Design a protein around this nucleic acid. Structure first.
Ligand SMILES: Nc1ncnc2c1ncn2[C@@H]1O[C@H](COP(=O)(O)OP(=O)(O)O)[C@@H](O)[C@H]1O
Ligand SMILES: Nc1ncnc2c1ncn2[C@@H]1O[C@H](COP(=O)(O)OP(=O)(O)O)[C@@H](O)[C@H]1O
Ligand SMILES: Nc1ncnc2c1ncn2[C@@H]1O[C@H](COP(=O)(O)OP(=O)(O)O)[C@@H](O)[C@H]1O
Ligand code: BEF
Ligand code: BEF
Ligand code: BEF
Ligand SMILES: [Mg+2]
Ligand SMILES: [Mg+2]
Ligand SMILES: [Mg+2]
Ligand SMILES: [Zn+2]
Ligand SMILES: [Zn+2]
Ligand SMILES: [Zn+2]
Ligand SMILES: [Zn+2]
Lengths: 334, 343, 362, 367, 360
DNA sequence: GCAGACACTACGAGTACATA
DNA sequence: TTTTTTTTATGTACTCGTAGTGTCTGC
């Protein structure tokens, strides 16, 4: 958690709406992961819950700010998946809803914030529906998603939406280079892979993701000219398998797009690699491999508890089958 | 401690009773027979207070009550029985049994019954405390190749003759289930006082009740025993085993097969088996499989298993069992499954 | 007047009145006539095949005044008394109702008391697969050192639900599901022992539809007599079964393979007269085609699950080339994929069957 | 006097007033006449075809004053409370509200006590497929050998949920869904008895709308009466159902197979003026295509409710190939798949019609 | 409820609801005559009004004047319903009381006489989330409830409902609201709230609501909170991500010509200007639809298609309808799969690559 | 008068199982 | 011999252990 400069306008606007008593109780943030998703929600919640003598800033002396910094306030509910789970169960939602009918202990307003509204199971969202539509007078909600459409349609209606604009790419590169010391092309590539959203591109360098990406690039450089797509299984099977699959998908998209001679490339840090991908693979084969990789990535994320070893191994075996001449490629279908 | 076999348990009890007996194993029949023998011999030698006391994590822990207190009525020696969990004791139970063995009357006999315990429970303080005086007897189900000798021995125990066809039929019908095997031998003894069991009698006096574990199915597929494989799958369907366990048990060996076939064209099998950490009993197994199935059948099997797993964990379908039968057909044997059972 | 149900009044009372299952009757007769009687018999079977009746007969035989014999006299006061519900030594425990250990203790403490009348206090615990874990522990403690004067008789439907330790101390008699011929023979005897006219074809249909259990056969016989105006005619039983048919799958796939459009239409109409989820019907039809394609590869594919429709299925496997089965499975799968978006589920499944029927013949 | 729901006012009160289900009524009446009374009945079948009503009628027949009579002799004292539902001995058990075994045990404890007034203490267990497994196992033995003065009537939608050991020891009566003609005739009787004017086409639409039930049909008729000014008129039924009668969609399919886009779009505009749901238009057209396929395969497949257009049906049955019918059906089915994702539902339907027109295998659009 | 729309603007009389002529007519005729029922089931998509019509029926049933079609207005046993100080009514959000125990508790408290009013009305909102055992529990009571209780059920969709529950209730299908009805209601609200509004921005809001009125109100509130506290065309256009230029047509032409570099540079520039991708795809489908419509008759040039007639005219002359249908199908599949993509931009890229490969 | 003695009712947990 | 073991979100029962309450008696 850290503050971002580009969050300052949105924050101000939204808080300016809240101070007048006109802001909607149910706010749905569209911020991309790594963007000012949690920082904005925390800032707004801290402003709302405690007193506001200083205006839109933080009055750290008041007991409300003290409880926020201690993280022990009773009227600041957080909906998060537990350590041992991934989705957000309906039991926590039901319990928080029952707790909401209780009047505020401190006599101030109430705030209920969900860490990520996409993680809700259908029952959880349905349970929230009634409280979102008709909440107690002291209550304000805050939702966080990457994709509003992935949410339940009825819940996506009751909650007023709000969008965070990704910063211009030059501004993003300027901000990233300040505290991250990498090459300009590598920095641009990391920014583009994260859909222009900082933090996530910063997260690629801060964590161990970048070394994994480089290992993946080396493995592709070894595999593509030989048609031996196996031995990629080691570079792909991981707790971040969707992210590395997305990296592979970006590489394939870059190859296919450069085949048409497009101006800009998603993967600029490794022009030789994408050039090799263009050389050794037919455009139809590249398109089929890209489609299959994206589909299996969606399979990995959607269904829960699926053994990834089997899925990535099957994907690689099917890719090796595709590279063989005289093989019918699949057709995208409804 | 003494590590012993069910055959020699009679001699071990005859020479002299030890402080405690740990009868362990996966089969019910041999465990029951050993426990009955121990109880009878203890009663012959002066043990009368017999207590059955399940250990399973629950609201049942007061065994200490029966050992700290001398018997007022008679100087009757006591016998305590413990039924270990399906996976063995945990850390809390480990220390609780360590406390239990911290104090034991010389006239108190301890009986513990459960499945095999790995090194994780073997090196626990409880077992190390028991390592001096207690005698542990292992009772394991004889393998499918070892069953006929055991059945012959049991027939000789009851003064019966079976020739060879009846022995094969009984081994097939009650494979991996010795309890039903002994009960059926007793039933055949009751049916014909002549004792000359033949096929035209054991054929209709037998059941199909069999027991299995996914390893048997995987090995049956590897050897290509089609009828045995389908029989195991049907028996597991009747038993109600979780399909996911079968899926994973096959997936491990199938990934190993895929990798070994991939590496076979460049490296000799002797080095590959050592590098891939393969058990010594399975080497030939793997060899046969590798020399039988090409990478095309392996890729088709992987596609089939992937479709099975995805339809299991996404569509919540019930077509899992028929699909695993299809995989059995497509694995070592006859690969057809043309799209029909190939996605 | 009071016409007792055929399921009750025709319960056997001697071992000679028990159909088939000789592998258990002979064993029990040899055990009783000789001295070898185990301390606890556990009876197993499938859905009304003769477990409780044989257990009651065994309890009758154990306590007969003439002595422990294979054949009870049926005349002494004990035979008459156990014949009816009332008797002291034989304790009939509905284990499925008194599952709690609190109720089980009140009846397993009676073992310490002497039998009032007969040699053995016999506990007939019916539906034993329902007891609670603690009750099972209590019953195991009783069975570990049972008194010489008490014999336990346990009857159940699913033996494997029992814990292994209790099963290890019981001699288990597994009762075979009755064959079609034995069913038909016993049904003919039952009908002839009473005043019910019949036609042999009707009894053949009853036996085949009884799924190898005498209770099912007798229930269907009473239903047929009721709807048959006091006479069991072939047409009455056939029409009733048509009202009761559930295997629309195999018949419909037979018609679809043979390409009888009118038969497919009639069978769809019949399956619409009965409330049937079309998705379930289609998916299990896919399963039947899957099993057919498997049997194409190896005769051992058809396990013991589908023994009631083995012959037909085997025929359908033998007479049809595998390629047609693969094509039928493909078209049925794609029809089921688009099924929920059709006009109606009935409507969509109808046209899916039409698509599958237009190929190969016609 | 007063206005109570048809679904509860017109519940059958005798075996004469139960429409259809000839086999179950015949078997029950015949068995009661012969005196052969089984001690466990299980009425299966789809929703709203009379299993609860038939069971209550069986209770009437069993507990009637004059004796065990197949036909309940009108209204006697022991039948008045059955009609009012306050009977001393007919124990209605909402099994879904008593699924726990600790309630079936209480049910079984008092089973032996003699009936207060009736000949039998008929236990009517509504929704028997909802009892917990323990309660099932509890009632096994009491079903096997019940006391001579108790009977069990079990009614459920799907018997498959019940353990087979319960299906064994009880009679299984299966109530087939009623035919369209049965529903239409019963509805004509009901609307005549209510002194309400009605239109034959309206009642045919009511019969077709309900899937072989009756209480669903009665509910939809009551909703029609609400939508109309106390009258069931064809326009009111068309509005409430959202259907296209049998003419407009036929005009659509006739124009589409004629490859005349102008009339297709003109009727699309008219249907928009009719204020009708677009997916309803698509589903009606798909149903018409399927009916064409059915009549092409089976020569005699049209019911009476389509007779008004039957002739035109046969025209398409003699003019268009089966392959073209399949092509149109699959094209419009993908159109249905894609419609919720088009920019506008009207726009999507226009695109689906134009797609069926462009891939017309006989008169495709010029390139 | 300070200034949140669609909460302080809940309808309070039958004359105030928007559209729903059939449902309102049926309910009014039932109330006016004796034709009352014990299970009404209002089903329809989001924000068409299920709960509101339910509450209006409840107010009409329990009014001091008696069974009245139009609710009175000023009275105690109607203002209490409006404020939630109700005792004859029971609102249960079934999505929270899914447990069968709570449903059995409800059925246990169904015999008790109401404290006030003639009917104890149980409003079960979000019916389809009840667990199956709860549904079976409610089944018998719905079949034949006591004369003094009436059930009202509202669900987003009836598919999840067990078919028996459908066969128990009177089904009222709330049709989605057309563009004109939504626009009229929003203009009426803004006029009654004295908020500056512009007809074009109002049309964009009505178009983006997708036939659900609560969405229209929420979008109006988002516009009000944005901009300068007033509804203006520029602010609404900016926030909705709508495109009002010929970028869509240029992209269609480039994709038809398969000009890869140009057709990708167009998407790159669109991302630079930040055009929302779902709207861009929707307009692409609209333009292809106009192509297909013109191929039947040039009068199906959408009005005068702004001022770019020629282009589409030219396009309508150069591409066979088969390729147009192929492009439309590919674009629609891409729109369906667009949410299930790592990010919308690259999903639109996938859709464009799929569309370009048909020898364009 | 008073624990105290049951006597009973409720609740948690361990466990089984259903559905999707 | 040998060690080897899996999806989950949610809901529904059943059974035992143990606390909290009532009352009722011979204390
Ligand atoms: N072997 C048999 N001989 C005669 N009748 C039988 C036999 N088995 C079952 N039945 C019939 O089925 C009815 C119920 O039998 P029962 O023995 O209770 O079956 P279960 O094994 O399921 O308890 C009996 O009344 C009898 O009519
Ligand atoms: N066979 C039938 N004959 C006449 N009315 C019927 C019939 N089946 C259903 N109904 C109508 O439906 C109403 C309720 O029927 P019911 O018997 O409860 O169906 P269910 O089988 O679903 O419980 C009855 O009041 C009656 O009007
Ligand atoms: N027909 C309508 N007339 C007026 N406002 C409506 C209408 N439908 C929905 N709304 C608005 O939507 C808000 C929620 O309506 P509601 O009736 O709860 O929809 P639902 O059917 O989805 O529960 C209401 O507060 C009202 O502002
Ligand atoms: F009485 Be049996 F076990 F069906
Ligand atoms: F009992 Be029915 F399903 F209305
Ligand atoms: F939001 Be509504 F109840 F569908
Ligand atoms: Mg029985
Ligand atoms: Mg009913
Ligand atoms: Mg609602
Ligand atoms: Zn503060
Ligand atoms: Zn006798
Ligand atoms: Zn009468
Ligand atoms: Zn009022």
């Amino acid at each position: 958690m850290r503050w971002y400069p580009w969050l300052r306008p949105d924050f101000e606007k939204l808080v300016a709406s809240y101070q007048a008593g006109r802001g909607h109780h149910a706010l749905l943030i569209q911020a991309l992961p790594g963007m000012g998703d949690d920082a904005l929600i925390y800032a707004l919640s801290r402003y709302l819950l405690c007193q506001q003598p200083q205006g839109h800033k933080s009055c750290g002396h008041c007991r409300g700010c003290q409880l926020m910094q201690a993280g022990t306030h009773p009227d600041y509910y957080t909906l998060a998946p537990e350590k041992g789970k991934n989705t957000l169960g309906v039991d926590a939602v039901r319990e928080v809803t029952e707790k909401l009918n209780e009047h505020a202990r401190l006599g101030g307003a109430k705030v209920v914030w969900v860490t990520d509204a996409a993680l809700l199971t259908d029952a959880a969202a349905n349970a929230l529906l009634k409280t979102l539509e008709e909440p107690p007078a002291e209550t304000w909600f805050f939702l966080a998603t990457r994709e509003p459409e992935r949410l339940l349609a009825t819940l996506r209606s009751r909650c007023r939406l709000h969008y965070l604009a990704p910063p211009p790419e030059q501004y993003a590169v300027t901000w990233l280079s300040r505290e991250v010391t990498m090459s300009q092309d590598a920095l641009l590539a990391a920014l583009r892979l994260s859909a222009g959203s900082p933090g996530a591109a910063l997260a690629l360098f801060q964590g161990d993701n970048w070394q994994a990406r480089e290992t993946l690039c080396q493995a592709l450089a070894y595999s593509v000219p030989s048609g031996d797509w196996y031995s990629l299984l080691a570079a792909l099977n991981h707790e971040q398998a969707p992210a590395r699959l997305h990296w592979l998908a970006t590489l394939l998209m870059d190859a296919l797009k450069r085949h048409h001679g497009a101006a800009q490339v998603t993967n600029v840090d490794v022009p030789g690699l994408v050039a090799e991908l263009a050389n050794h693979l037919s455009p139809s084969r590249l398109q089929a491999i890209l489609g299959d990789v994206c589909h299996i990535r969606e399979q990995l994320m959607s269904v829960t508890g699926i053994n990834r070893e089997l899925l990535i191994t099957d994907l690689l075996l099917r890719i090796e089958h595709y590279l063989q001449p005289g093989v019918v490629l699949p057709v995208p279908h409804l | 401690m003494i590590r012993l076999y069910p055959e020699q348990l009679r001699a071990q009890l005859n020479e002299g009773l030890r402080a405690a007996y740990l009868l362990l194993g996966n089969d019910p029949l041999l465990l029951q027979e050993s426990q009955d023998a121990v109880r009878q011999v203890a009663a012959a030698q002066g043990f009368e207070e017999h207590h059955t006391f399940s250990i399973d994590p629950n609201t049942d822990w007061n065994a200490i009550f029966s050992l700290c207190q001398a018997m007022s009525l008679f100087a009757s020696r006591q016998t305590l029985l413990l039924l270990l969990p399906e996976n063995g004791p945990n850390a809390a139970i480990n220390e609780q049994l360590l406390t239990l063995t911290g104090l034991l009357h010389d006239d108190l006999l301890l009986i513990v019954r459960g499945n095999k315990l790995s090194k994780a429970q073997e090196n626990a303080a409880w077992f190390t405390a028991l390592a001096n005086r207690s005698v542990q007897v292992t009772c394991q189900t004889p393998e499918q190749a070892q069953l006929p000798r055991w059945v012959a021995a049991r027939a000789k125990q009851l003064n019966l003759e079976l020739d060879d066809a009846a022995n094969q039929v009984l081994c097939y019908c009650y494979e991996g289930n010795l309890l039903a095997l002994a009960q059926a031998l007793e039933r055949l003894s009751l049916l014909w006082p002549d004792g000359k069991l033949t096929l035209p009698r054991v054929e209709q006096a037998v059941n199909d009740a069999a027991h299995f574990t996914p390893f048997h199915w995987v090995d049956a597929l590897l050897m290509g025993k089609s009828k045995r494989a389908l029989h195991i799958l049907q028996q597991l369907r009747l038993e109600g085993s979780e399909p996911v366990i079968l899926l994973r048990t096959l997936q491990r060996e199938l990934l190993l097969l895929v990798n070994l076939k991939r590496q076979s064209a460049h490296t000799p099998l002797r080095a590959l088996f050592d590098k891939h950490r393969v058990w010594q009993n399975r080497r030939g197994m793997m060899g046969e499989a590798l020399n039988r199935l090409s990478q095309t059948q392996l890729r088709q099997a992987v596609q089939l298993l992937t479709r099975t797993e995805l339809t299991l964990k996404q569509d919540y379908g019930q077509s899992v069992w028929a699909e695993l039968e299809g995989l059995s057909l497509l694995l070592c044997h006859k690969p057809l499954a043309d799209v029909f059972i190939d996605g | 007047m009071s016409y007792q149900v055929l399921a009750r009044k025709w319960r056997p009372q001697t071992f000679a009145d028990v159909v088939g299952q000789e592998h258990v009757l002979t064993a029990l007769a040899n055990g009783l006539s000789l001295g070898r009687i185990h301390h606890a018999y556990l009876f197993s079977g499938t859905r009304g095949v003769g477990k409780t009746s044989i257990a009651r007969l065994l309890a009758k035989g154990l306590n007969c005044e003439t002595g422990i014999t294979a054949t009870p006299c049926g005349v002494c006061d004990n035979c008459r008394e156990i014949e009816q519900g009332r008797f002291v030594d034989l304790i009939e425990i509905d284990a499925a109702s008194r599952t709690k250990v609190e109720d089980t203790r009140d009846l397993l403490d009676n073992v310490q008391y002497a039998p009032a009348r007969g040699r053995f206090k016999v506990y007939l615990i019916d539906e034993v697969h329902m007891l609670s874990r603690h009750s099972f522990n209590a019953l195991l403690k009783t069975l570990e050192e049972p008194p010489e004067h008490v014999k336990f008789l346990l009857a159940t439907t699913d033996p494997q639900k029992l814990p292994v330790t209790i099963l290890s101390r019981c001699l288990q008699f597994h009762l075979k599901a009755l064959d079609v011929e034995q069913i038909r023979h016993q049904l003919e005897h039952i009908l002839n022992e009473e005043h019910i006219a019949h036609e042999p074809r009707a009894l053949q249909l009853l036996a085949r539809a009884a799924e190898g259990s005498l209770r099912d056969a007798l229930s269907l016989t009473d239903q047929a007599i009721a709807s048959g105006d006091g006479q069991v005619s072939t047409q009455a039983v056939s029409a009733m079964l048509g009202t009761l048919d559930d295997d629309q799958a195999l018949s419909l796939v037979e018609a679809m393979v043979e390409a009888n459009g009118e038969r497919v239409m009639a069978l769809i109409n019949e399956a619409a007269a009965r409330g049937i989820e079309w998705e379930a019907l289609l998916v299990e039809m896919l399963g039947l085609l899957h099993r057919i394609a498997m049997v194409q590869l190896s005769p051992a594919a058809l396990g013991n699950d589908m023994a009631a429709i083995e012959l037909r299925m085997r025929e359908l496997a033998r007479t049809i080339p595998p390629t047609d089965i693969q094509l039928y499975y493909q078209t049925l799968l794609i029809g089921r994929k688009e099924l929920p978006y059709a006009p109606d589920r009935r409507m969509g499944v109808e046209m899916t069957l039409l698509r599958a029927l237009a190929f190969h013949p016609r």
